[PDB]
């Protein structure tokens, strides 16, 4: 649509959004698969964080393809996860970083004042540091979650390391590229017609 | 025969701080459209004159 409303529900910056939109313009299909299943991947973290800002049918919720990982039983143990791209397709991995409105929230959720997030792959490397600041409210949030992504080539490995503030990948997409497809911005009605 | 087929082409999004790219992209599209419109119309006028003279 020329004016979509359902985009980022937990306000933040989407890194390289325009480049991703361009890359997804040649994708004809994909497999949505669970990259890091929440049920078995994090036994020592809470995988149930939600936000009112992502409310669905009246209940607080969160992004379907991401997990908000907060501490458990007063601790926030160091995370280390990896994935090997055995799909024989490029894989799009999405994740994010939480930037609390204040230090009270940072301690309450991650039990550290010095969290970091580190994501690497053979040809990718980023380290993120949460930047705590009280921001103007957007969708009632004084904090923010930024979103990041990368593509894995077949056979590579991606590693996620953190001691707090990570919004972990849950689902990822195995991208099958085609040709001649693209993205249309339009309000035209949909029908059962066929055209060349 | 001398005018080729138009193949899939879609627009691009740009950020707030990418205005110079946005403007170049538009400039390129408008320039090519203005040129092809010129060529299509001129060719038709030139050939319509010759057709009538031929007859």
């Amino acid at each position: 649509t020329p004016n979509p409303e359902n985009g980022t529900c937990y306000p933040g910056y989407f890194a390289d959004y325009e480049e991703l939109r361009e890359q997804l313009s040649s994708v004809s299909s994909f497999e949505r698969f669970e990259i890091f299943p929440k049920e078995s991947s994090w036994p020592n973290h809470t995988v149930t964080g939600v936000s009112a800002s992502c409310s669905h049918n009246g209940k607080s919720s969160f992004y379907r393809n991401l997990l908000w990982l907060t501490g458990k039983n007063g601790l926030y143990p160091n995370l280390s996860k990896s994935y090997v791209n055995n799909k024989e397709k490029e894989v799009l991995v999405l994740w994010g970083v939480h930037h609390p409105p204040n230090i009270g929230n940072q301690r309450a959720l991650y039990h550290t004042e010095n969290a970091y997030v580190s994501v690497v792959s053979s040809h990718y490397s980023r380290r993120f540091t949460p930047e705590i600041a009280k921001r103007p409210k957007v969708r009632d949030q004084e904090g923010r979650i930024n979103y990041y992504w990368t593509l894995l080539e077949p056979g590579d490995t991606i590693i996620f390391e953190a001691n707090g503030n990570l919004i972990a990948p849950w689902y990822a997409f195995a991208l099958s590229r085609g040709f001649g497809s693209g993205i249309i911005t339009s309000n035209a009605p949909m029908d059962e017609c066929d055209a060349k | 025969e001398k005018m080729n087929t138009q193949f899939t082409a879609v627009g691009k999004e740009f950020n707030k701080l990418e205005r110079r790219m946005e403007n170049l992209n538009k400039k390129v599209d408008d320039g090519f459209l203005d040129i092809w419109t010129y060529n299509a119309e001129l060719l038709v006028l030139l050939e319509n004159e010759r057709t009538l003279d031929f007859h």
Partner: antibody
Amino acid sequence: QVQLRESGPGLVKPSQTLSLTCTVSGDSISNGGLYWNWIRQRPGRGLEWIGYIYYNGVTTYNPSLRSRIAISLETAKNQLSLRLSSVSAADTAIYYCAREGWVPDYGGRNYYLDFWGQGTLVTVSS
Amino acid sequence: DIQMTQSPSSLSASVGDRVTITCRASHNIQNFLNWYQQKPGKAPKLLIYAASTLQSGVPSRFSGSGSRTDFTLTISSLQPEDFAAYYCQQSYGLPRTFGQGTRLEIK
């Protein structure tokens, strides 16, 4: 020259369906390939778009009223029609029909409303 | 829906003066902006078609221009017959919208 003329009761009772007709002359709603619009103006307010119908019967509506609005078209008589179910006080307005014309531009056809009709005032009361 | 905001809501100026009415879109609508003149009791008349062009029959005193979001309607040498409400319309998206309108009073 192109002329549009709206017509209808001018008075509808609450919970009745309002039905207006626009007769198009000096043009052809089976040949032009244009969109035919309905708009309204509540007294004291600016203009609000209702919806439009194309030559192929393809119809779009203002999403705030889409559940109530029906728009149709009869090419044989050059007539457009508008129906609003469950009419209430909020629907008092001058209703207008309009022709949407165009000139090709950079970015596609650049559309505008040129022939606007006269306007029919409809009061909702009992 | 793309919102159109006009400013001022009301303007008065004497005959022969210059009137500038502006309109701001919430979204980039490129050149898809029409301007209309509404005399009391009548359907609106088209003045400006492309953001910068006139409809045949429109007096040369009317002009306008604009870019992505910021557009202007200008009346040079204002005459008594120019008393009207003026409206800003976008034709870029489907849920067509008009601004709230500007009432132009004379003197």
